[PDB]
Symmetry: D2
Subunit: 250 residues, 4 copies
Amino acid sequence: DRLKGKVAIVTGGTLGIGLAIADKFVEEGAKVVITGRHADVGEKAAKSIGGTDVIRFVQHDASDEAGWTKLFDTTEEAFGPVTTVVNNAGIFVSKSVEDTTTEEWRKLLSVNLDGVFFGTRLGIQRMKNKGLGASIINMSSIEGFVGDPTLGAYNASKGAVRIMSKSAALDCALKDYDVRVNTVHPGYIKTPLVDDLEGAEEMMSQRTKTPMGHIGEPNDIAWICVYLASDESKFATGAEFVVDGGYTAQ
Amino acid sequence: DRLKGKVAIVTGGTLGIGLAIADKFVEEGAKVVITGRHADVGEKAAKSIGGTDVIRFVQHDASDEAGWTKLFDTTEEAFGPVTTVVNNAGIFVSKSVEDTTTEEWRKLLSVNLDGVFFGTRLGIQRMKNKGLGASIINMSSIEGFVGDPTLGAYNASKGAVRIMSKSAALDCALKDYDVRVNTVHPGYIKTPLVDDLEGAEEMMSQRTKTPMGHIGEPNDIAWICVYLASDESKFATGAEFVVDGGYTAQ
Amino acid sequence: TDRLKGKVAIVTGGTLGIGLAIADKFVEEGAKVVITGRHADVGEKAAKSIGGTDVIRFVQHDASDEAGWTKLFDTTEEAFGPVTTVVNNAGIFVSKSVEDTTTEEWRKLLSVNLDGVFFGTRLGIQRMKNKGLGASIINMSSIEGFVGDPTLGAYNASKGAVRIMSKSAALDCALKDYDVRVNTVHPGYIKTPLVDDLEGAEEMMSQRTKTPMGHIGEPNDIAWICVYLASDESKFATGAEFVVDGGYTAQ
Amino acid sequence: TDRLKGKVAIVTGGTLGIGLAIADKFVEEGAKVVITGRHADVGEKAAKSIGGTDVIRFVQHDASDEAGWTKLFDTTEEAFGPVTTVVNNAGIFVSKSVEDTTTEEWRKLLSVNLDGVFFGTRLGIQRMKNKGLGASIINMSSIEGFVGDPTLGAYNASKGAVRIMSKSAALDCALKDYDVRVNTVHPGYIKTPLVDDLEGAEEMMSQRTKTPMGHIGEPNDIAWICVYLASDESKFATGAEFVVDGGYTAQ
Ligand SMILES: [Mg+2]
Ligand SMILES: [Mg+2]
Ligand SMILES: [Mg+2]
Ligand SMILES: [Mg+2]
């Protein structure tokens, strides 16, 4: 029981990485609310992990600012005060900066940046000063460290999350809020997105990309998140945790 | 004449750092168009540097997407094809993430992030494949490297610029566009903003902040920009240039 | 429930402070451990303080002793089976500016903090590759592997060397399918016996301009990220840097 | 118009490649320069190839020769006046994995690439502080000070050590108002005589998976960022890293 007593919100927790985070959190004794845009998918994902005594689904788009309040209230009414927020929801656009439409730019940033801001801001307000050993875990990427010529807007969003989380981490530390803020940086992981992009896994598995020569699995990200959520990581804040098969080491 | 033949757009070039960039560019033989929101201020700034044969003002807000096209066309009609873009325009908000209003968040990001995207995207389209030795210089900050508890949105914007510029730099390199993209990261510089924030220069000059014990001057940033604009830096792309009196070294 | 079932770890400088907590929690998680140290009385007592001889043993060794590393691996293998995990934690401190550093101080620090980490990494790769052990080499760097300190010149040099050299080793092992991962851990200020001996040290480290949390860490703070890195939980993490510093490097 | 008026620079390993171009452009910008190298015939010829004895001179010196550094400063001061600029560019290459690195190779590389940079930095601070010279110490790191290379273990270690040790020295000088700045330059792949001797080297380095621009740089590419760092133009830049690598580290 490494997350005994923890109560977590995992955005985009109905598929891939987010689903695995939710799975392993529940396994380690946390109570979890997962969010998603699709109710049928979301309800099924929750039940695949456990009963309503340990996990619940809430239909929510991370860019829905007002919905964030409903998300915290619903999670609190179900499991008690929230202790853990994982801002994992996000979308992918494959365009160069040159080729990015303004509509694409705005759409992606509204989820990947504004959504994380909404979750972090409200997270700090609701969890500070309550002695919860609170932890906000913001999902960046290797794309928050290095550029990719075909991921301009994605790059922008992940670099923004990377540094904005440090700001939040320092404010919470300096004010003795008992809230930690950290970023996780996955490399290429086998997810529904990757499976659906023809040729993606093949390009990602090249040694010039991922030195291990294969892409990761959603559990690879889940376990580092269990670490950051647990009181094991009580001295870790404002830091970057990279799980990428060596992508950024070369 | 280190910028002989260069033609530069400098956004927010009517005050502080941007004004100094424009000054030293003209000094080194470049033709310059500076932009600003205020016509009286802008016209006066241009004339303070030189005549219309070497520098001109164009009234423009960097978040005005359509205006970017007018900005390139006007600069080209005046001086010939643009070779250099310095995305320097930006605003400052002093709020923690916790305390940032959504209106403040959006306003700041629209200039500091969208504006830089607009300039970079159009810059690549207009300067690629023309053999101009083109250079796009995006103004980040030390705030693109480290957090500040009271600069949440600013942090987000500067981290976004930092990584998005790498994406643009790689795309241009891989496609042999003859366009380089780099970021400059000023520490604390004596600017109209700093002069106007009561107590700011004092806090900034603490040895725990800036190891040199004083803040910089706008020319400190101008000279690194002359370097990046010139063909001297033809092998430099996707890199970060920090001029900060030691702020990030500790 | 043991997170380190079947692992066999060598922890250098494991008789005190951070090294001791690493060994403690490693044994707690089902690993067998050999700790090293320069002083036998302290070391043997340290081993017994954690558990029985069936799970933890002491070996007297200076990390700069190249020949001794072979004995360390052989002795550990003979007691517990093939080594799966190496933690290069041993190191010394010198408080001098670059300007004020004697060459004797420079060489002595580097021989332990750099050469010793090299010896352990190199031999670790040779001895653990291709055995399917889920092998993990954990090199102790520091916040001083990221940022300078005006009064820690040689220390900075050693910690930055470890930071990047580990990436080289991580890449070679990955590219060769060696089943060895290499990562660095970067502690901030931790309450250790060294810190306890320096009067006022903890107070200075706890200033918000230094450590934003306003207090320094504890050895267990480093132990738990090392358990993560040692476990198969982290099978996709290699060549990366793990910082646990109370916010020191975030500002 | 000279950007380096009044400067007096020592450039180690300045008889070939990157070091030579640094010295060349330094003299072009009004500095007086002493270049060092291990071989006198090449070195004296290298000095004359740039300019007259009133602006550039050769001194035979191995950067790992600690005692020789004092002679280097004294000889340079006697010819041109107080030294204002030091470029620690000298270094050697070993192509071995960490696993395959002999300790002799490890020690030899580190003695030049690390110890030599230390000797120059330490003495540079002692000799140039408080003289109001606009002093600048420029330490040559590399892309290998940022990222690992599986076949460059010792090189990685040395270049990461230089990267962080320079920050320590930069901080101490800043905090003490020494009027000395310390910075690191990080070349990517550059067309140098070493590269020319390795058949196929340039071709491999020019692959887009390595250098995104699809070609490698030239020594002048490094010379011009060094001119910037040497000049009073960069009076607010210290403890920072300047990367000129054709995009190598951006991906
Ligand atoms: Mg125990
Ligand atoms: Mg700092
Ligand atoms: Mg010449
Ligand atoms: Mg890379």
